[PDB]
Design a protein around this ligand. Structure first.
Ligand SMILES: Nc1ncnc2c1ncn2[C@@H]1O[C@H](COP(=O)(O)OP(=O)(O)OP(O)(O)=S)[C@@H](O)[C@H]1O
Length: 267
């Protein structure tokens, strides 16, 4: 609420409160009364335009699965603290946390797809998210997912498709492509790059040569296998989302409906 609040809430930015740091922000945990926050300390015109883009999105649009801006000062942005961390960290079991069970994994994918579906259709101009990734998906105390990072958003590089890298093109289908790779991480528990090939290339090669049921062998070993058709629907959906040709990718609306029927077969 005040900046004085952030100094006290961090014991003046003591290291005990430092969460981490990226390219644009230094990030601290802040305790203000009986709520916990993460403050992203704005640390180059490129940097600046990405700060504005983050502010623009979060001040105008709101969704249960988008991490909301609570306050800002101007230089910093304050968000509610997400105690279960990033999807990436949980898939990689950072800190020796237990692997996520399938019903949470599919719930995470559904929530994020709703957030993207909402952003792709907000009343004035639609929003292309631009930085969809397992790192930018945060998780609350019940593993409800929260989409974050709109520094690359636009109104209409492992996660980026060819037509973006090669020709600068950007669309609704950009987010679908990135989301497809996230599904691949969620199914396998692998990083986007493997110990040195890309997860997307490995799964696409396997699906073309050996069909959808052969990916069963790449399901995350740290849980018992999900049902066969759950796996096949999700690998299929991931492969289509990550297609090289944008025209082959489903809309996020169709993705959401597919994810939701996939969840039903789990129950
Ligand atoms: N609301 C939050 N709750 C918990 N951890 C958070 C929150 N916001 C940021 N973090 C973490 O703080 C650390 C640093 O954040 P980053 O996302 O790397 O910052 P950034 O400067 O926006 O990043 P870019 O993408 O590299 S510009 C990461 O480990 C994040 O997961």
């Amino acid at each position: 609420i005040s900046f004085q609040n952030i100094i006290e809430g961090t014991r003046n930015f003591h290291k005990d409160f430092l969460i981490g740091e990226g390219e644009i922000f230094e990030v601290y945990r802040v305790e203000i009364q009986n709520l916990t926050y993460a403050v992203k300390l704005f640390k180059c015109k490129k940097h600046w335009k990405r700060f504005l883009s983050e502010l623009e999105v979060l001040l105008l649009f709101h969704h249960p699965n988008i991490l909301e801006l609570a306050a800002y000062f101007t230089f910093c942005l304050i968000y509610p603290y997400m105690r279960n961390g990033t999807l990436f960290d949980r898939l990689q079991c950072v800190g020796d946390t237990a692997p996520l069970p399938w019903h949470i994994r599919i719930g995470i994918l559904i929530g994020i797809s709703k957030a993207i579906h909402y952003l792709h259709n907000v009343q004035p101009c639609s929003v292309i998210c631009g930085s969809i990734s397992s790192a930018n998906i945060l998780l609350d105390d019940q593993f409800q997912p929260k989409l974050t990072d709109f520094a690359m958003a636009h109104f209409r590089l492992w996660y980026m498709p060819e037509e973006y890298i090669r020709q600068g093109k950007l669309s609704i289908k950009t987010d679908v492509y990135s989301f497809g790779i996230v599904i691949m991480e969620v199914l396998t528990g692998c990083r986007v790059v493997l110990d040195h090939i890309q997860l997307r290339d490995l799964l696409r090669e396997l699906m073309e040569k050996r069909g959808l049921d052969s990916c069963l062998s790449f399901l995350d070993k740290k849980v018992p296998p999900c049902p066969r058709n759950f796996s096949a629907k999700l690998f299929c959906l991931a492969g289509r989302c990550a297609a090289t040709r944008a025209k082959l990718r489903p809309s996020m609306d169709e993705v959401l409906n597919t994810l939701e029927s996939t969840q039903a077969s789990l129950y």
